[PDB]
Design an enzyme around this catalytic site. Structure first.
Site, PDB file in Angstrom:
ATOM      1  N   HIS A  66       0.806  -1.222   0.000  1.00 57.02           N
ATOM      2  CA  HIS A  66       0.000   0.000   0.000  1.00 57.02           C
ATOM      3  C   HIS A  66       0.843   1.278   0.000  1.00 57.02           C
ATOM      4  O   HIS A  66       0.291   2.360  -0.165  1.00 57.02           O
ATOM      5  CB  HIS A  66      -1.072  -0.020   1.093  1.00 57.02           C
ATOM      6  CG  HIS A  66      -0.654   0.181   2.514  1.00 57.02           C
ATOM      7  ND1 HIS A  66      -0.081   1.315   3.051  1.00 57.02           N
ATOM      8  CD2 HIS A  66      -0.853  -0.653   3.551  1.00 57.02           C
ATOM      9  CE1 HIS A  66       0.097   1.142   4.362  1.00 57.02           C
ATOM     10  NE2 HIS A  66      -0.367  -0.053   4.684  1.00 57.02           N
ATOM     11  N   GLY A 104       2.208   6.114  10.496  1.00 51.01           N
ATOM     12  CA  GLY A 104       3.632   6.010  10.180  1.00 51.01           C
ATOM     13  C   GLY A 104       4.260   4.678  10.623  1.00 51.01           C
ATOM     14  O   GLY A 104       5.418   4.392  10.293  1.00 51.01           O
ATOM     15  N   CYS A 160       3.209   1.585   9.758  1.00 47.73           N
ATOM     16  CA  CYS A 160       3.098   0.505   8.781  1.00 47.73           C
ATOM     17  C   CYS A 160       4.485   0.012   8.353  1.00 47.73           C
ATOM     18  O   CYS A 160       5.425   0.809   8.218  1.00 47.73           O
ATOM     19  CB  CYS A 160       2.312   0.921   7.551  1.00 47.73           C
ATOM     20  SG  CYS A 160       0.602   1.386   7.935  1.00 47.73           S
TER      21      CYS A 160
HETATM   22  O1  LIG Z   1      -4.544   1.910   8.877  1.00 47.53           O
HETATM   23  C1  LIG Z   1      -3.632   2.515   8.292  1.00 47.53           C
HETATM   24  N1  LIG Z   1      -3.689   2.878   6.984  1.00 47.53           N
HETATM   25  C2  LIG Z   1      -4.908   2.930   6.190  1.00 47.53           C
HETATM   26  C3  LIG Z   1      -5.096   4.060   5.179  1.00 47.53           C
HETATM   27  C4  LIG Z   1      -6.548   4.171   4.733  1.00 47.53           C
HETATM   28  S1  LIG Z   1      -7.650   2.737   4.968  1.00 47.53           S
HETATM   29  C5  LIG Z   1      -6.452   1.443   4.993  1.00 47.53           C
HETATM   30  C6  LIG Z   1      -6.834   0.234   4.415  1.00 47.53           C
HETATM   31  C7  LIG Z   1      -5.953  -0.831   4.379  1.00 47.53           C
HETATM   32  C8  LIG Z   1      -4.704  -0.656   4.904  1.00 47.53           C
HETATM   33  F1  LIG Z   1      -3.837  -1.699   4.878  1.00 47.53           F
HETATM   34  C9  LIG Z   1      -4.295   0.509   5.498  1.00 47.53           C
HETATM   35  C10 LIG Z   1      -5.178   1.588   5.542  1.00 47.53           C
HETATM   36  N2  LIG Z   1      -2.470   2.823   8.877  1.00 47.53           N
HETATM   37  N3  LIG Z   1      -2.215   2.563  10.210  1.00 47.53           N
HETATM   38  C11 LIG Z   1      -1.589   1.492  10.752  1.00 47.53           C
HETATM   39  N4  LIG Z   1      -1.520   1.541  12.062  1.00 47.53           N
HETATM   40  C12 LIG Z   1      -2.120   2.756  12.402  1.00 47.53           C
HETATM   41  C13 LIG Z   1      -2.351   3.319  13.653  1.00 47.53           C
HETATM   42  C14 LIG Z   1      -3.004   4.544  13.723  1.00 47.53           C
HETATM   43  C15 LIG Z   1      -3.456   5.186  12.567  1.00 47.53           C
HETATM   44  C16 LIG Z   1      -3.256   4.621  11.310  1.00 47.53           C
HETATM   45  C17 LIG Z   1      -2.588   3.404  11.257  1.00 47.53           C
END
Ligand SMILES: O=C(N[C@H]1CCSc2ccc(F)cc21)Nn1cnc2ccccc21
Ligand SMILES: O=C(N[C@H]1CCSc2ccc(F)cc21)Nn1cnc2ccccc21
Ligand code: NA
EC number: 3.4.19.12
Lengths: 306, 302
Positions: B41, B143, B145
């Protein structure tokens, strides 16, 4: 989101752990530049520990009585001295993995990471606080002496703890890296016992602020308190007094959440009176006191989930 | 004495964490030999993330669109490909700090250490279990990921988890290092939720054994039970079934303490039916299920 007991990454400390042997006694040492720091009780036998005369034991030792092992390599000891309750062994090689570091003596309530080690080899890392009674609630087996506690704010390792002993209640006592014991403890087998412990009030409040930041408000109430009334109630639950220093330190968390410190104190008063009534706060059924105001800011978002 | 949620020393993993940037997205990568692994992603923007065609998005990218930073040094990307939900960036330098390692897929109930990282810089280490619902109760901000989970089984690092997302309940979802999700999750912006979780029974029993080893004995009793009777009780309290495999696995702890597993199950039965009556076990008012039998032996004997 989430909230975990999180330790600092241990790699900068792992590169400094060595094994120290004197006679039949083996424990851990910390190798920084050309010095290895370890508990002076490495020079004691069985008998010695009731009433050891460390000066007399040490004067009988030569450099080559100390075997220091760094991974596979023997280091050569070329000097020794004793500072308080630590032995400083001068070795012939500077540790090439020496990090940027400092020695700091901490106050009760402060947290740090422990790298538990056996035979100079790291086993595990976990987060600990210095209790009001100057013990730590660690996890340590025989052979763990010389294991260290540390913080890493930036790239600089702040060593604050060296492990020396387990007390009869199963909690742990040690020194700063200058060899001064935390608390009234001595490196001698006598009747010494942990003083009655108390809860670290400032840390509990910090953790309540963490719960609010993470979206949790159920435990707030409409009341406030004076500082002195708060402390009169707190002390009845074996909570440490809260000082104006502590109020000042919580200022930023107060700003992030819009809850005045003495209003959060009123919430804590009510929690102590009521308990949680089947609820949890950040996954806990007890009030947590091993996160500092600094640790909450380090770990939590600065955006509260309103 | 003492019993703590203990992580593996993170040093061998710290030397593999890098920053990966594609467009305005920066996250963490794992640099092993001459490949950097990160969540696919990274190639998506906000809009792309609604309905991404990863194959199409990737084929439009050049090597030089990927900025990889190892501390102060830029690595040059010389190839890119995808395996499931992870992106593999071939770089021009082999990581000199590459440890002995394997990629392993873990089972729900198993534990691992997480090195949480931001901008390719490790910030913290903590211990997690893979929940029965395939989520982890992590601590992660934006941040994070590409942060990874691991065990160490001698000098060998077994990488088992890479972080991809946070769910609406504040728990976390990710992949193994071959890019296969744990759980029924996808890397896109859709409505996704954690399923109802259950308690990991074998782990609770392990932790009860830890408590006994540490001198906490008040919950032991004179009674025993059978697997079938115990399992009726488990099901009622949203506990995972206990299998004969689980009983076999607890064998060592049973020997060390002289409490047969079904004897300890009789204790657990009573705790579930009656609560703790104001008492705690290893300092906890709840029954802890994030220590495996192996974790208890490792900490209470090694
Ligand atoms: O969930 C996260 N990214 C989203 C972007 C938009 S919907 C989405 C959908 C699938 C995916 F694999 C990732 C994502 N990032 N993420 C990972 N740990 C976190 C902790 C706090 C806030 C965001 C955090
Ligand atoms: O307590 C320890 N040594 C004793 C020996 C005799 S009385 C004594 C007195 C002073 C001292 F500095 C050390 C000691 N080692 N130690 C440290 N963590 C442990 C955990 C489990 C068992 C022993 C553990
Ligand atoms: Na029983």
């Amino acid at each position: 989101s989430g909230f975990r007991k999180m330790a600092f990454p241990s790699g900068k400390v792992e590169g400094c752990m060595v094994q120290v042997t004197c006679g039949t006694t083996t424990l851990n040492g910390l190798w920084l530049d050309d010095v290895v720091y370890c508990p002076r009780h490495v020079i004691c036998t069985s008998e010695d520990m009731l009433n050891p005369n460390y000066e007399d034991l040490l004067i009988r030792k030569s450099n080559h009585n100390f075997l220091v092992q760094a991974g596979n390599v023997q280091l050569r000891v070329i000097g020794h001295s004793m500072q308080n309750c630590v032995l400083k062994l001068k070795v012939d090689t500077a540790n090439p993995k020496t990090p940027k570091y400092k020695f700091v003596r901490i106050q009760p309530g402060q947290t740090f990471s422990v790298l538990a080690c056996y035979n100079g080899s790291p086993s595990g890392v976990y987060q600990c606080a210095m209790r009001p009674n100057f013990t730590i609630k660690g996890s340590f087996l025989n052979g763990s002496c010389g294991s260290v506690g540390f913080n890493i704010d930036y790239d600089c390792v702040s060593f604050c703890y060296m492990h020396h002993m387990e007390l009869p209640t199963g909690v742990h006592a040690g020194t700063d890296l200058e060899g001064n014991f935390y608390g009234p403890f001595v490196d001698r087998q006598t009747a010494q016992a942990a003083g009655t412990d108390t809860t670290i009030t400032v840390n509990v409040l910090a953790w309540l602020y963490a719960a609010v930041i993470n979206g949790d408000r159920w435990f707030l109430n409409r009341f406030t308190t004076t500082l002195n009334d708060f402390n009169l109630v707190a002390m009845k639950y074996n909570y440490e007094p809260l000082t104006q220093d502590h109020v000042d330190i919580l200022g930023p968390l107060s700003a992030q959440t819009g809850i005045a410190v003495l209003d959060m104190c009123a919430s804590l008063k009510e929690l102590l009176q009521n308990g949680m009534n089947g609820r949890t706060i950040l996954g806990s059924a007890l009030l947590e006191d091993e996160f500092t105001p600094f640790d909450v800011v380090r770990q939590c978002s600065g955006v509260t989930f309103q």
